[PDB]
Design a protein around this motif. Structure first.
Motif, PDB file in Angstrom:
ATOM      1  N   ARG A  65      12.843  27.713 -48.676  1.00 22.85           N
ATOM      2  CA  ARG A  65      11.461  27.875 -48.231  1.00 22.85           C
ATOM      3  C   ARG A  65      10.825  28.683 -49.365  1.00 22.85           C
ATOM      4  O   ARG A  65      11.021  29.897 -49.464  1.00 22.85           O
ATOM      5  CB  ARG A  65      11.377  28.645 -46.904  1.00 22.85           C
ATOM      6  CG  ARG A  65      11.735  27.839 -45.653  1.00 22.85           C
ATOM      7  CD  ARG A  65      10.737  26.721 -45.371  1.00 22.85           C
ATOM      8  NE  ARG A  65      11.101  25.928 -44.195  1.00 22.85           N
ATOM      9  CZ  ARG A  65      10.665  26.154 -42.959  1.00 22.85           C
ATOM     10  NH1 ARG A  65       9.832  27.155 -42.720  1.00 22.85           N
ATOM     11  NH2 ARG A  65      11.068  25.382 -41.959  1.00 22.85           N
ATOM     12  N   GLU A 101       5.282  31.541 -35.307  1.00 25.61           N
ATOM     13  CA  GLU A 101       5.172  30.611 -34.205  1.00 25.61           C
ATOM     14  C   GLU A 101       5.867  31.235 -32.984  1.00 25.61           C
ATOM     15  O   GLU A 101       6.713  32.121 -33.126  1.00 25.61           O
ATOM     16  CB  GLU A 101       5.804  29.261 -34.578  1.00 25.61           C
ATOM     17  CG  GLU A 101       7.318  29.247 -34.559  1.00 25.61           C
ATOM     18  CD  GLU A 101       7.906  27.895 -34.940  1.00 25.61           C
ATOM     19  OE1 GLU A 101       7.367  26.862 -34.496  1.00 25.61           O
ATOM     20  OE2 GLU A 101       8.922  27.863 -35.670  1.00 25.61           O
ATOM     21  N   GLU A 109      17.628  29.449 -43.745  1.00 23.86           N
ATOM     22  CA  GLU A 109      17.112  29.711 -42.417  1.00 23.86           C
ATOM     23  C   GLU A 109      16.961  28.289 -41.875  1.00 23.86           C
ATOM     24  O   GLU A 109      17.929  27.526 -41.869  1.00 23.86           O
ATOM     25  CB  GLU A 109      15.758  30.424 -42.456  1.00 23.86           C
ATOM     26  CG  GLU A 109      15.247  30.810 -41.066  1.00 23.86           C
ATOM     27  CD  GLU A 109      13.784  30.445 -40.854  1.00 23.86           C
ATOM     28  OE1 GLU A 109      13.373  29.352 -41.299  1.00 23.86           O
ATOM     29  OE2 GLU A 109      13.048  31.242 -40.229  1.00 23.86           O
ATOM     30  N   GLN A 110      15.755  27.918 -41.460  1.00 26.18           N
ATOM     31  CA  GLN A 110      15.509  26.585 -40.921  1.00 26.18           C
ATOM     32  C   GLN A 110      15.836  25.488 -41.936  1.00 26.18           C
ATOM     33  O   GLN A 110      16.475  24.488 -41.604  1.00 26.18           O
ATOM     34  CB  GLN A 110      14.058  26.480 -40.467  1.00 26.18           C
ATOM     35  CG  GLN A 110      13.668  25.126 -39.953  1.00 26.18           C
ATOM     36  CD  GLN A 110      12.440  25.192 -39.092  1.00 26.18           C
ATOM     37  OE1 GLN A 110      11.793  24.182 -38.841  1.00 26.18           O
ATOM     38  NE2 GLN A 110      12.117  26.387 -38.617  1.00 26.18           N
TER      39      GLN A 110
HETATM   40 MG   LIG Z   1       9.666  29.215 -38.871  1.00 23.20          MG
END
Ligand SMILES: [Mg+2]
Ligand SMILES: Nc1ncnc2c1ncn2[C@@H]1O[C@H](COP(=O)(O)OP(=O)(O)O)[C@@H](O)[C@H]1O
Ligand SMILES: NC(=[NH2+])NCCC[C@H](N)C(=O)O
Length: 356
Positions: free
Chosen positions: A228, A313, A223-224
């Motif tokens: 993660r 967010e 993802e980003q």
């Molecule tokens: Mg995020």
């Protein structure tokens, strides 16, 4: 750098300059000096300033606005990254280096809300980047699949409480996906900031999520960031959560080569997740304190804490349930990170009880 790029730059730059109300760090820090001083630069992988500030330009409502297409981008554009890093992380001078990884005395962490009348869930996460692999923007479809394979394989050897199954995004039922997201387990899809940053090409190839059946230990793939590593659960037992995350990261760190900069610590795609790549958080309710998200956020800030919406967010709070977490990540140890979140949340609890 070719003209076109330079055109869009001058253009973008002008745009920012015309957004009288833009409050992103990009605007606040991209001065003409800083601009002209780097705009012509390029990296061994042709990453350019446009590839760095683009999401900021197109998404003026950005808070930060920039990304690093690759490790090099961090020093090549230092003139920009530097003040931004310093601003966001609450002070990180040029001469400042990031302390060695340090989990701290796990036994010094405590239950955040004993009576359980505010905290719904406690999440703590980190981020890692595979050595030999640049960030999203410079990736090739073939590379997403490669990384997916290495990670899932490694994770396959996870045992005990950390044992689980890897579920590729490719081929996942819309239902299953939508649910996993609704339960705050899986990353959201189609983030506008990540898109304009070119971090979603070939989606959802190579994207996925590994988790123990309990779903109290998870790992987001592509993802980003490359990885993660997450540890969450209902309740307020930070100790357990952190301890679990530590057992996880270390174990994984022993099998996969992760990118670590001497000045920035573990490297990430966004300048906000550098250092300890840690974000400790809780979905907490504070009816009286949250009577207005303004004063709530003002309070949070005094404790170096950040306020997010229930779905993450850039979202709204759903039912007075906010995501309060530690803002700063670089310039302090993992321990100091989870510590800022713990201390801030304990006081906020106390403050809530003393409010009319
Ligand atoms: Mg995020
Ligand atoms: N304390 C928490 N409990 C449950 N879900 C949470 C909690 N903290 C964060 N999340 C979830 O993390 C997910 C990704 O949110 P985001 O704000 O992008 O954080 P990050 O990328 O740092 O993990 C969202 O689904 C959000 O609801
Ligand atoms: N996941 C993150 N990096 N969040 C913070 C930055 C998000 C968005 N680029 C604004 O500014």
């Amino acid at each position: 750098v070719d003209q076109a790029t330079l055109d869009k730059l001058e253009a973008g730059f002008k745009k920012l300059q015309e957004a009288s109300d833009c409050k992103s760090l990009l605007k606040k820090h991209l001065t003409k000096d800083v601009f002209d001083s780097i705009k012509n630069k390029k990296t061994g992988m042709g990453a350019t300033l446009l590839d760095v500030i683009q999401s900021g330009v197109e998404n003026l409502d950005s808070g930060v606005g920039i990304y690093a297409p690759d490790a090099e981008s961090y020093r090549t554009f230092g003139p920009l990254f530097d003040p931004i890093i310093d601003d966001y992380h609450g002070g990180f001078k040029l001469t400042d280096k990031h302390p060695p990884k340090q989990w701290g005395d796990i036994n010094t962490l405590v239950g955040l809300d004993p009576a359980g009348q505010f905290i719904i869930s406690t999440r703590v996460r980190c981020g890692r980047s595979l050595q030999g692999y640049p960030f999203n923007p410079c990736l090739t479809a073939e590379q997403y699949k490669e990384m997916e394979e290495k990670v899932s394989s490694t994770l396959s050897s996870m045992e005990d409480e950390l044992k689980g199954t890897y579920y590729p995004l490719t081929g996942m039922s819309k239902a299953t996906q939508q649910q996993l997201i609704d339960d705050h387990f899986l990353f959201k899809e189609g983030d506008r900031f990540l898109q304009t940053a070119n971090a979603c090409r070939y989606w959802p190839t190579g994207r996925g999520i590994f988790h123990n059946d309990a779903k109290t230990f998870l790992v987001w793939v592509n993802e980003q960031d490359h990885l993660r590593i997450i540890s969450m659960q209902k309740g307020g037992d930070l100790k357990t959560v952190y301890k679990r995350l530590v057992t996880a990261v270390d174990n994984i760190e022993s099998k996969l080569p992760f990118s670590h900069d001497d000045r920035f610590g573990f490297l990430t795609f966004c300048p906000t997740n550098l250092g300890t790549t840690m974000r400790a958080s809780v979905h907490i309710q504070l009816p009286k304190l949250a009577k207005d998200r303004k004063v709530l956020e003002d309070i949070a800030s005094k404790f170096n804490l950040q306020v997010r919406g229930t779905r993450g967010e850039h979202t709204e709070s759903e039912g007075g349930v906010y995501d309060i977490s530690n803002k700063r990540r670089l310039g302090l140890t993992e321990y100091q990170a989870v510590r800022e979140m713990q201390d801030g949340i304990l006081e906020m609890i106390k403050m809530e009880k003393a409010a009319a």
